[PDB]
């Protein structure tokens, strides 16, 4: 039904919000510290000097284990 299409779209959008903002291919699993923005996979987060969201200096990257992880 049309209701099925609406639910498919909500699911797709939620799952797309879980992917890296830089490569769009791998799941987000890394946090820039101390700002806390958690928007990148480990590879893309590794060479950034400043946060791509708020421009704060990245002192270090903290790996995150999220219950939503499926890759």
| Cα–Cα dist 1/64, whole Å | 38
Residue 64 as a binder of a copy of itself (CB under 8 A): the answer is yes
Site mask for a copy of itself (CB under 8 A), range 11-50, x = bound:
x--xx-xx--x------x--x-xxxxxxx-----------
| Residue 2, φ and ψ in degrees, nearest 5 | -60, -35
Residues forming contacts to Zn ion in the complex (CB under 5 A) are 20, 22-23, 26, 35, 37, 41, 44, 51, 53-54, 56
CB of 44 to a copy of itself, least distance (A): 14
Query: Whose Cβ is closer to a copy of itself: residue 49's or residue 66's?
Result: 66
6 membership: H or E segment, kind and range? helix 2-16
């Amino acid at each position: 039904s049309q209701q099925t299409r609406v639910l498919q779209e909500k699911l797709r959008k939620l799952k797309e919000a879980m992917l890296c903002m830089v490569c769009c291919e791998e799941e987000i699993n890394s946090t820039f510290c101390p700002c806390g923005h958690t928007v990148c996979c480990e590879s893309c987060a590794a060479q950034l000097q400043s946060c791509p969201v708020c421009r704060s200096r990245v002192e270090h990257v903290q790996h995150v284990y999220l219950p939503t992880h499926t890759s």
